Amino acid sequence: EMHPRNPYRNKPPDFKALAVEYPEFRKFCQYVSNGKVTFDFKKDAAVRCLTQTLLKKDFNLDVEIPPGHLVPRVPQKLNYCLLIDDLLKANKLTKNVIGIDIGTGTSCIHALIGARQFNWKFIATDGDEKSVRVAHENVAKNGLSSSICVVHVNPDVKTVLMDVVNTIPDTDYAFCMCNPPFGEVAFVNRIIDDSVLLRDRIKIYTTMIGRKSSLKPLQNRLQRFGDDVKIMISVLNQGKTKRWMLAWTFSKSVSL
């Protein structure tokens, strides 16, 4: 009941099998006389290693998450990827899928997961320098330099996308992912300012959102374009997590 096509909905990771296959992960597994494998989720090292192990075993991705960073959760990021995959299916844009990932984080997890599981290509973007260092490192480790292009942006500029879409000027991109920096209204409104430009150059605009009451103004802004744009909102899995997805398109050739 996480997501219909998520491989983790009905095949939860077997921590004993992961312990056997990956020894650096089973140091964080508290195997005891209980007969089961016990795992502490309240320690950051354990969650970091769990994410690393899942990426290695299920996506052939050796990734480093450095200390003091967000620890990505593979199932939820994969849910975002699949939600984007379905809309490309409906609007039949599943040929040469070039997308733009914003705020990739330290690990470009959206870019790597898309390039591995969906064969996508990405223009990846982050505003934090150590994160772009580690992003270049991860892309080069996994050999996806021919699939993901990682670009640093100075966060001072209003534009988040127009400095990026310059990278390849003869391409009309398919979509953009974003995980906003954790207030959010200003960031997403900058994205929307880029959205009223570059109108059909990017077919579908998407972003996650964490703050609850950030939806009312943003949507208020989007419906200010009236019939010119289409708007859609979606949810995530795990229940207790509080994240939404917001998508919009000026294209009439698309259907959210």
Helix (H) or strand (E) holding 207: strand 204-209
| Alpha carbons 134 and 112: distance in angstroms, whole number | 13
CB proximity list for 237: less than 8 A, separation 6 or greater: 1, 2, 3, 6, 75, 76, 79
What is the CA 61 to chain-centroid distance, rounded? Answer: 15
At residue 66, φ and ψ (nearest 5 deg) are -75, 165
Q: Do the annotations mark residue 228 as ligand-binding?
A: no
The radius of gyration of the chain from alpha carbons, rounded to an integer in Å, stands at 19
Judge whether 96 is annotated as a binding position.
Answer: no
Is residue 147 within 8 Å of residue 173, measured between CB atoms? no
The whole-angstrom distance between residue 131's C-alpha and the CA centroid of its chain comes to 14
Report how far residue 99's alpha carbon sits from residue 105's, in angstroms, rounded to the nearest whole number. 16
The residues that bridge with 245 in the sheet, in sequence order, are 208, 234
The answer to whether the CB of 128 falls within 8 A of the CB of 93 is no
Bridge-based pairing of strands 230-235 and 244-249 is antiparallel
Residues whose CB falls within 8 Å of the CB of residue 123, separated by 6 or more in sequence, listed in order: 98, 99, 100, 101, 148, 149, 151, 164, 165, 167, 168, 173
Helix%, strand%, coil% for the chain, nearest 5:
40, 15, 45
| Of residues 125, 206, 207, 191, the one with CA closest to residue 158 | 191
- Whose tokens are 């744009």? That residue is 229
- The method of structure determination was X-ray
Do 180 and 218 contact (CB within 8 A), yes or no?
Answer: no
201 within 8 A of 165, measured Cβ to Cβ: yes
Distance CA 1, CA 227 (A): 34
**DSSP code per residue over 111-140:** HHHHHHHS--EEEEEES-HHHHHHHHHHHH
Known binding residue 179? Answer is yes
Which residue type does 89 have?
K
Strand partners, 102: 125, 178
Answer yes or no: is 58 a known binding residue.
Answer: no
**What is the structure's resolution, reported in angstroms to one decimal?**
3.0
Residue 103 counted as an annotated binding residue: yes
DSSP assigned state of 226: G
